Amino acid sequence: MDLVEEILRLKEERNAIILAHNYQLPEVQDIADFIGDSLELARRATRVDADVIVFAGVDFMAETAKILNPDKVVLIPSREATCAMANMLKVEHILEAKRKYPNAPVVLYVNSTAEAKAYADVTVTSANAVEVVKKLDSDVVIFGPDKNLAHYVAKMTGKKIIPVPSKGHCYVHQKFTLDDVERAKKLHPNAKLMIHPECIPEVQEKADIIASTGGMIKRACEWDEWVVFTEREMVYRLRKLYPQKKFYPAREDAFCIGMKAITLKNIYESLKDMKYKVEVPEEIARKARKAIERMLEMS
Numbered sequence: 001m002d003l004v005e006e007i008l009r010l011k012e013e014r015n016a017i018i019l020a021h022n023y024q025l026p027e028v029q030d031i032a033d034f035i036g037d038s039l040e041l042a043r044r045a046t047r048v049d050a051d052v053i054v055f056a057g058v059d060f061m062a063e064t065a066k067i068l069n070p071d072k073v074v075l076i077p078s079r080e081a082t083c084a085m086a087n088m089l090k091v092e093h094i095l096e097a098k099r100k101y102p103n104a105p106v107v108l109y110v111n112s113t114a115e116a117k118a119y120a121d122v123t124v125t126s127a128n129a130v131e132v133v134k135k136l137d138s139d140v141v142i143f144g145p146d147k148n149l150a151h152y153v154a155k156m157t158g159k160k161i162i163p164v165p166s167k168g169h170c171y172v173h174q175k176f177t178l179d180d181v182e183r184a185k186k187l188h189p190n191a192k193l194m195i196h197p198e199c200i201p202e203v204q205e206k207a208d209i210i211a212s213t214g215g216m217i218k219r220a221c222e223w224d225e226w227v228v229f230t231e232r233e234m235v236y237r238l239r240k241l242y243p244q245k246k247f248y249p250a251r252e253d254a255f256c257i258g259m260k261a262i263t264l265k266n267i268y269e270s271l272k273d274m275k276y277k278v279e280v281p282e283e284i285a286r287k288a289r290k291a292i293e294r295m296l297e298m299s
């Protein structure tokens, strides 16, 4: 079976769009209608004319698309496409922090459950966390789940950051070390380093640019050679966008298992079977939607 041909036909039959994250397998990126980071996928979720969304990404991302498109069918091809860091944050963490700091806005990374977003004042992604936190009317904000992004936000805004939970992090980005920075500079001495803010702070400090994957794409025009400190499928994405540049993985083994639960075959099966339908309870969705819409307004 020609999976690509079958998917193209089913997209037409289902009036479906495929939205893909930047960490998707190359063959999935190649059949997606739109590819982007967390923030771009959320905005693109607000101008969907199609009836069905196939979300080639992890669960919290498909949930966000469903919150913004409650009357469209949102399909996740595997329920094992999940984010380890997003599931570190529970409602009880948020409520405990709200108790200690009732006047602190609750700022939740989009890497969170819809249930957790129901208790947020505003959501953020890596691309807009600093701008959003800067503009909130408070010198202290509750922020999670990623402590490494928390550190970056604190450094850039000067505000006091109350992490929820205590040790939230992404195992993929925590793989990068100072030895990887030293190896990169030795193998590719003419390259600059683009580093995701989910990397540990001492690695962040070695960056030529700190950026979300979306900002990596935006700023890649500033140099012709880059070592890429994020999930390794980002190198494919950058190479396709800028064939005239050179991109090298900082670590080939920087692999997100949840992202790679999505396959060409189960995208085909997703459209064929109309599964797995993503649903968000109306009251959770209403409250999460308020925080997300406020994020999109605050840029």
Ligand code: SF4
Pocket (backbone or CB within 6 Å): 058, 082, 083, 084, 085, 086, 111, 170, 171, 172, 173, 231, 256, 257, 258, 259
């Ligand atoms: S890369 Fe890390 S933060 Fe992003 S989805 Fe995978 S586990 Fe979650």
